[PDB]
């Protein structure tokens, strides 16, 4: 998965 914490 991407990770809920990676997009910022």
């Amino acid at each position: 998965a991407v990770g809920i914490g990676a997009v910022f």
Partner: antibody, heavy 118, light 113 residues
Framework: QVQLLQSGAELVRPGASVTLSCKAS????????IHWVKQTPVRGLDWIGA????????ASNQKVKGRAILTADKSSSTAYMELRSLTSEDSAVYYC???????????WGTGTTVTVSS | DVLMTQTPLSLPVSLGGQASISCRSS???????????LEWYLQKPGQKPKLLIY???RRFSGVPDRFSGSGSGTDFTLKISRVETEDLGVYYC?????????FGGGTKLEIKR
């Protein structure tokens, strides 16, 4: 020697809360998020939520909410998931697993068997 | 939200045979980094879930080459060659590109002997 340790089982009265513990060993705690996955009796994995110790972010899937509180204790390298006002619909085996950014669920916990009953 | 339809619900295959599991998403599961975060997991009876395939076609460390993943857009396939007794369990596709992340319904491998 990466491992994720969870409590064996929790029996919860209906309408109460439970706090599940997922504690990591063998790696830098803040470099991996901790995700929680609910497994139902015969099949069905259901992603409940996640916490990122690096950023402090939280997220949950929407069948549960008002009730899931995801935290982590970096001091003690421990993640926690609180689930409020439980019904028999929450009784399941709850697994914790780790996720590096753009990685995958490579290491899983033993799982905590939660039973909601009077 | 993103929906994951897995077929079949159970899959009988002879020992040493060839198995094919299909998974199909409600939307495209290409992420905003260019990659497609499609994963395959196995949960044996009484054991914790295990990772086999990530990034539609890439094999996790320790997973044999008999397991082959492939996919294109909304249709994804896991292929298991020369099926072993150790292959028994429920296989789950997983999308990790759009939160909430979602699993498939699972496919139960029952082997004929």
């Amino acid at each position: 020697q990466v491992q994720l340790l969870q409590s064996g089982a929790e029996l919860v009265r209906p309408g109460a809360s439970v706090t599940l513990s997922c504690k990591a060993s063998g790696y830098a705690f803040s470099d991996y998020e901790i995700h929680w996955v609910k497994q139902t009796p015969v099949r069905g994995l259901d992603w409940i939520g996640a916490f990122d110790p690096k950023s402090g972010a939280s997220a949950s899937n929407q069948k549960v909410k008002g009730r899931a509180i995801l935290t982590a204790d970096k001091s003690s390298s421990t993640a926690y998931m609180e689930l409020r006002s439980l019904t028999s619909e929450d009784s399941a085996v709850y697994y914790c697993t780790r996720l590096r950014y753009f990685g995958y669920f490579d290491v899983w916990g033993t799982g905590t068997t939660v039973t909601v009953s009077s | 939200d993103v929906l994951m339809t897995q077929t079949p619900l159970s899959l009988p295959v002879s020992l040493g045979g060839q198995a094919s599991i299909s998974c199909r998403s409600s939307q495209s599961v290409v992420y905003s980094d260019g990659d497609t975060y499609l994963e395959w997991y196995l949960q044996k009876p009484g054991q914790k879930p295990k990772l086999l395939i990530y990034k539609v076609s890439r094999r996790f460390s320790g997973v044999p080459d008999r397991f082959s993943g492939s996919g294109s857009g909304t249709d994804f396939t896991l292929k298991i060659s020369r099926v072993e007794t150790e292959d028994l369990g429920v296989y789950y596709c997983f999308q990790g590109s759009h939160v909430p992340y979602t699993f498939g319904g699972g496919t139960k491998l029952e082997i004929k002997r």
